Structures are given as structure tokens and as C-alpha cells.
Amino acid sequence: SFSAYLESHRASLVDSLRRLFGHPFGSFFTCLVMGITLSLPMGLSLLLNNVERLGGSWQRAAQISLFLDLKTSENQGQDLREQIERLPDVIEAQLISREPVISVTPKQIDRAGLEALRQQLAELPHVQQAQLDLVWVERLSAILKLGERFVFGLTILLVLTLLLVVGNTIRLHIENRRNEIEVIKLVGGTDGYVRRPFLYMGALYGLGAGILSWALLAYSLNWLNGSVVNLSGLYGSDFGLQGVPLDDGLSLTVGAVLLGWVGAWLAVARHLRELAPR
Amino acid sequence: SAYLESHRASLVDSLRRLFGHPFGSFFTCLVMGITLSLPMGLSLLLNNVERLGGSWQRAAQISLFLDLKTSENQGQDLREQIERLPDVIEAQLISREQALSELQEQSPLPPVISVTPKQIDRAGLEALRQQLAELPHVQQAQLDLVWVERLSAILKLGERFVFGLTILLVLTLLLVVGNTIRLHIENRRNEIEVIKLVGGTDGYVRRPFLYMGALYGLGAGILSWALLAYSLNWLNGSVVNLSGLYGSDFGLQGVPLDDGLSLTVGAVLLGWVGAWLAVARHLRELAPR
Amino acid sequence: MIRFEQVGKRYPNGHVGLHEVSFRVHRGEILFVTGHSGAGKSTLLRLILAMERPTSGKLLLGGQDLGRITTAQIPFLRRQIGVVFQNHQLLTDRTVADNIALPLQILGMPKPEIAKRVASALERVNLKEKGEALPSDLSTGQQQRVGIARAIVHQPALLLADQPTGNLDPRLASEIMGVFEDINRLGTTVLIASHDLALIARMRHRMLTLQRGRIIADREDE
Amino acid sequence: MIRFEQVGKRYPNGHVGLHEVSFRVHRGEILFVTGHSGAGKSTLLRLILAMERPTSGKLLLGGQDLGRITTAQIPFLRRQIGVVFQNHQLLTDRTVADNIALPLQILGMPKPEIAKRVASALERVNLKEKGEALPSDLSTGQQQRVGIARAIVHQPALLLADQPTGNLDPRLASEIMGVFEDINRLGTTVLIASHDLALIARMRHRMLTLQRGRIIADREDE
Ligand SMILES: Nc1ncnc2c1ncn2[C@@H]1O[C@H](COP(=O)(O)OP(=O)(O)OP(=O)(O)O)[C@@H](O)[C@H]1O
């Protein structure tokens, strides 16, 4: 009955819309909750991604201050400039004049012990004094991976709270209006037949929530742009937090839809197993 | 006198209705507990950094280089003289003879001074910096004007950010708790109309749901308290690492008793009010006249 | 003193619940109103419950009319009626005995007499050892008996019922209606309504009939 | 081919809903069941409905016994029989038309002839003017006959039903069991049960009477 297979989906959807359009205040009140819940995790992903764009402040400092010989020689420093480019754990040793020294920023942070590379660097044409402070490396390495534990914890906690709220709400909603699940079953019908409409309105709730979060997050970031552009121009730069990419937003919404769908399976399964003839 | 009598029965069945269907009730309690945990969890670390309030200032500190030869006792009194002036978290004396040696180890010399303010606005602090350059024996006031304005900007984004997060999360919590309570109340209407058609006052038909909401709030609050304590202890692994490396005495204390009490009482109050609002809708709905 | 003047029901859906009626029931009386399927009997009785708006016309309850009445005043009036409903309304997941005791619990009467009262009600309804159970357990006739028991308790000054013996065997129907007759012997009134009049025709009563939303297809036949 | 043998259901709670039963029924025959209040009749036919298990003995329906049946096979047998219940079950917020049409979509047919068939079912119950209305709107007997029509449609190969016209006009039930006989005119077996002994003395009858789980309070008596 493939033709009827198509008809089941068609009638199921239009009925849900009438059910959804009916009782609008309650449906909106529900949809808003998991929309705003869904906003938080992906919003934090966007925030961390945006700060990843400004990925030069991590290294920033901690340049090996290899003092060039007190006697002025720009040519010798320019000659040794390119060798540092070859080696890893560095970027480029830019030659500086007396008004001499040459410096290079690292890529990672490492820790105490990687200054053996600095002592090895203090064997070059221009070596007056190798200068690479340690304690800064210590403090920076303490700050990082501490940030990593911190972000790890926030991420996992927030993912769990989102999953719990969406699952519980879908479960309770399915528990209400129970009479259908049996009144259709005893007279006949299959598992998929009774299951379909419940999949449908859950999918609609997920879609609506996914849409609402988009607008909320975009408005919030636009609100916060005021200070970020100020400080960006203020520091002598141009880095303002940007808007929502559509490619990411569609992935945001589809996740909500599939989440509602799987929640529909989970909620319906309990009742279906409960009302077994046993 | 029967007012007392009605209350006692409403508890017994409520607990009875609690343990009946325990898994679902626990699930609901857990969801709102973990939700309640987050805002207070963010609140406590603010108190922690407030306890470590010294490092907020004194990082972008303001220092002064005095005249070429300023008497040691002059600066020793000038730190106290500027102490009565507001923006001095600290005012420590460094004489000329001390400044000479200090510069010798860093690398006649102006006597230096240590001044940490409170406020952060660049304009008021730079005006006070010119005043610090207008002291009886000061010569120049070292202030990277870019440092002070950068510091001023540093507060603004942070305070706006925390304000936004708080205002978002509090209403998120309100919405989730209200919606879940409303959904339970929407379930089980038939008894409501059964008693209503029989008779009875609003309070009689109302009380059991209020007790149910109160107990849900209590359970969620307790569970949130426990989870927050566990999370703080788990995070504590790395906080002591920096304390040792830098050299300090900061460690994240957790869950003081008074705050846990406040958390639970707030939770039960929210349950109460959510139940009352949810039942009001149906009671209004079922009014023919 | 029950008295109806010209009053009828129009439903907002455009359908006419009731055209117009005018009645008067003296105190202590008994009524056995009946009719065809479409007759608005259940709506008629629901009108007395004041759970429906009078619509076209006005209606009186002795000293006070059924209209412009405080909603807060309604529970007091409902306290004086032990009505039963065709679709018996029972509290699932709550024991049978407490289901019966509910009205007396509303009245705030001492617990120890509650058990003896509910036990006393059980014999009259002819149900032994079926208390302390759940309503979902019982059978249909048992549930109807349960509704009757809920109705009879606390000595209601007014008695309303709708299609009793909806599924009973004639034997049980006889004794229960005899109990209703005993209630009528007591200072009460009964307005039972049923489609089966063969049983009631054996006993002296006041049959009233309506049809097509009209007041009377047939008149009094005392 | 509806043979029973030594069956009886005892609840885990302790009650014995059914003591002992054994008999057979032939194809295309009218059946009737009566008994007292406590007799297990709704339970008896629920055994055929099989929301439970026999708890004793065995029953065979055609090739396969009802006990020990795959849940996947359950719809494939429950979609061949129309029923009605004392507490009628109807889909609220969905009007009468689709409420009746449900089995058609269950099997799955084009909508035009489906509306044709529901219209055809409408006149045999005399509810022409109720074609689009919520079940909550209907009067008490109206939804009962609505469920009856729900069983009537799709010409089920077999009918079970419960006490019909339990709240209906005695005259109006006449054409009702007349329609039942009209259905019985074809290869359709009816298992109706009731208490109104007055009208069960007209046509062919079998009077299977149950008394406290006892199969034989009566016999064929045809
Ligand atoms: N809420 C309503 N809105 C519109 N029409 C209604 C409403 N309730 C009832 N009606 C109409 O009024 C008619 C009579 O209503 P009523 O319920 O009282 O009949 P009844 O007393 O129950 O008789 P029976 O038991 O056989 O069904 C119904 O047939 C119905 O068509």
C-alpha cells in the first residue's frame, strides 16, 4: 500500500499543523524554552570560534631576546634572520636595529625545559646575551590547560542540561493526551501508524525552537558588538565579533529537528511497551 | 479548626504520589536541579574573585618618579599624604637611595612610589595622574596613557558580558521551571473538575499541587547543591597548581552552608509559585458563569 | 420549592438546546422525567447544577434564582447535592473507600465516624469487601454502584441522578430504587431520569415527558 | 470454530475473574449473554479481545490459539473485528466523520468512497444532521450510537460489541437490533450481551448465562 503510505504522512502533517496552530500560546511557550536552551551551547561554540580567529595573542609575547653583539652589524643579523625560519617552535626572527636585538615568537607555550633551544640559539653569529624569561612561561602554562579543564567542564555540563530538558519536556507532552495511543491500538493499526503524528509535532517543535535561537543569538551578539569594536579600535586593531554564518545556523536547526524526533521515539516507546498485553 | 486537618492528609498522598512512578519524578527533579545549579554556580566564582580582589587592580598600577633628589622622609610622608586621597589601595614609600638600587637590579634617579587606585575610567584616573604629577616633590607621572585607557576598556566588556549572561540565565531558569510545572498541572485535569462539580473551595482543590511543587523544588535544590559541590572539587585540581607556581594562597572553597540553604529555599518558593500560576489557568478555564 | 418559569437554552453553535419550559415542584416531591434520545434531559438536569448558563429565560431555586450568582457561592450550593452522572466520575489511583468519603471530607467531619458511615453505605448498595480497592479494578455495574454510594452518603437534602441501572440486572435495580424510595420517605426529593419506564410504571410516581427540545410531548400522569 | 475449553482467569491480586468455561460457537450465529452484576461478561469477551491472558486452559480461534501470540500479529487480528464498549472511547477534538472513518484509513482506501461509506453508515443510525461535530458536543446516547456505527462500517467479518442501547429509547433500540439482524443476514457472527431480557425473547437466541464465574447458569435454550 505504497500510495496509502504517502497518504499517512500527508494527513498526519496537516493535522499536526492544525493542532500546532490551535492552542498557540501554549505551543509558543513550550517552543521558546528549548529554543533558548539550544542557544547556549552553539553560542559558546561561536564565541570560542571567534576568539580563535584572533589567534595571535596566545603566542604574542615570549620572544627570545637574543642580544646581537654590542658592535653594530645589521648585515650579520640579516644573514642570520632566515635560519630561524627553518627551525620549528618559532615563526620568524625579525632583525631589529639599535634604536641591537632579534626576536621570534613561538607557536606553542611548552614549559621550562624548552629554553635549551634558547641556549642552543645563543651560539649564532650575533650572540651577546640570550634573553628568554622563564617565569612567564610558567604562569602562561598554568593559565592554559586550566582554561581547558574549565571549558571542558562547562561544555559537558551544558550539553547534559540541554539533553535533559528537551527529553523531559517531550516525554511529558507525549504522556499527556494518552487516550489515542490505546484507542487506535485496540481497534487495529500498526506501530508506525500510531507513531507517525507524534514524530511530526516533535519535529515541528524542534524546528521552531531552532529558528528562535537564531534570532536571539544574532540580536545578542549585535548588542555586544558595541564594546568589542570599541576596544578593537582602541588597542590599535580592527576585530569586531561577527554575525551568524548561515552554514552554521542550518546545522544548528537540523540538530534540533533530529533531537525532537529521537525524543519522540523515546517518549512513545515507554507507553507502547507499558500497554503490552503481557 | 479543620484547616490543620486538611494539610496533614495532603502531605501523605503527595509523598505517596511521589514514590509511585519514582523514575519519572526523579527525572523531572534532576532536570530542574541541574538547571538551578548553573546561575548560582556562576555567582559563587564571582565571590571567589572578589575575595581575590587585590589582583584586579595593581596590575595596571600607577607609579610616579619624583624630583631628582627628594628626601626619604618626604616620600615616607607622601605615601600617607596620598593615602587620605581615595585612589590608593596601597601607598608604599620608596626613597631615592632605594630607587637607585631598584633600578640597578632592574637593569639622581627619581624616588619611585607605589599607588594602586580603585576606579578604572581613564579620564578621571588620568586627571588624578596629572595631579600626581603636580605633587610637591614629584617630577613626572609615568602612565602609559594607552595602558590606562586599555584598563578602562577592560572593565566595560567584562561587566556588559556578565550582565548579559546573568539576565539571560535567570529568565531561562524561570521559563523552564514554570513550563514544567504547568505541564504537570495540565496533566490530571479530571479530578479537578470532579471535585469542582462536587463542590469544595479553591484552597481545598488547590493544596495538593502546591505541596507537590514544593517537594519537587526541595529535591531539585538538594541535588543541585550536591552537583555544584562535586564540580567545584573536581575543578580544584588545577587551581592549586597556579597557586603553587606563582606562589599564593588561593583555593576554591565550595558550598558554604548559608548559600545552600538559600538555594533550596528559593527552589521551593519557585515550585510554590509555579504551581499556583499553573492551577489558576485551569480554574479560570472551568468557569461557566 | 422548585419552580421553573419560561426559560430555554440556545447553544452558541447555533443549535437549540431547549426551546422553553415552565415547571413547579413542591417540596418533598419525586419526579421520573423521561423522553426520547434527542430530548435534552441531561442538559435539563445540568441546568439545575448551574454549570450551564440559563440563556433564554430565567430560573429560580426557591429563595434565590439561578443567575447573577457568585462563583464563590457555587461550592456551598453544590455541597447540598449528592448528584450522580451518567459517565460516572471516579478518582483513579485513589481507593474506593476514600472515593466515597470525599463529600464528608469536604464537610470536615471527624474521621472515626467516616469509616462507620462508609461501611453503612456499603450494605445499602450491596457491595461487601469491595472497598480499599482501586476503581480501575471494578466492573461497570460495580462502578455505577460506587457512584450511587458516593451520592447517597451524608444524607443529601437534595437528590439528583441520571439513568441509574444503566447496566444493572432488574433484580439489583429493584432494591436500589427501593432505597431511593426510602430516601423519599425521608425528607428528601428525587428527580431520577431514565428511558426504561416499564419498571417505574409499576409504582406510583409523576412521569413527565419532553420531545424535540419542547417543554412537553406529554403532561403529568400522577 | 470459536471453541472454549477449561479456561478461567484469576487475577494476581487474588480475585478469580473467571472460574471455568468450555463450549463452542458455529459460524454466522447470533449469540446472547446474560447474568447478574458480578458475572464476568466484559472480561469474558475481553478474552477474545486478548488484552490479557487466559490464566488457565486454552482457546482456539481458527488455525491459531489466542494464547501465546506474537504482538506483531495482534493488529492483523484486531483490525478484523468491530466492537463497542460500556465506557465508549472516542477521539476528542476530532469530529464524528473521521472518528467513524478511522478503520478505513487503518486499512487504507481512497477518500471519496470513504466519505460515501460514512454517509451510508450515517442514515442507518439516524444521525444525518450530526455530520461535523466534536464528540463532546453530542448527547449521551448519541456517542453510544456513534461508536455503534464505528463498529458497523467496513462490514467487519465479525462483531462483538457490548450492551447497546443501555441508555437509549426502547423504541429506538428496535430498529437497532433489527440492523444487527440485517448484519447477521450475511456471514457475520454477533456476540452481543445485555440485561434487557424483554427483547431477547423474539428472534433466535442462545442465552448463555454466567453466575460468579460459573459457565452454566443456563444452556442453549434455542
Ligand atoms: N454543548 C452543546 N452544544 C450544542 N448542542 C448541544 C450541546 N449539548 C447538547 N446539545 C444538543 O442538545 C441535545 C440534547 O442534549 P442532551 O444531552 O441533554 O440529551 P440527553 O438528555 O442526554 O438524552 P440522551 O441520553 O439520550 O442522549 C443534544 O442532542 C445535542 O444535539
Ligand SMILES: Nc1ncnc2c1ncn2[C@@H]1O[C@H](COP(=O)(O)OP(=O)(O)OP(=O)(O)O)[C@@H](O)[C@H]1O
Ligand atoms: N482488573 C480487575 N480487578 C478486580 N476485579 C476484577 C478485575 N477484572 C475482573 N474483575 C472481576 O470480574 C468480575 C466480573 O467481570 P466483568 O467485567 O466481565 O463484569 P461485567 O460482565 O462486565 O458486569 P458489570 O460490569 O455490569 O458489573 C468483576 O465483578 C470483578 O470483580
Ligand SMILES: [Mg+2]
Ligand atoms: Mg440526557
